[PDB]
């Protein structure tokens, strides 16, 4: 069950990283 959250985490976690750098200027 604990493993449902974390999935649902890794989706909007990689997502930071390619818009993260848009964010950076």
Request: proline share 0%; hydrophobic share 50%.
């Amino acid at each position: 069950n604990w493993f449902d959250i974390t999935n649902w985490l890794w989706y909007i976690k990689l997502f930071i990283m390619i818009v993260g750098k848009k964010k950076k200027k």
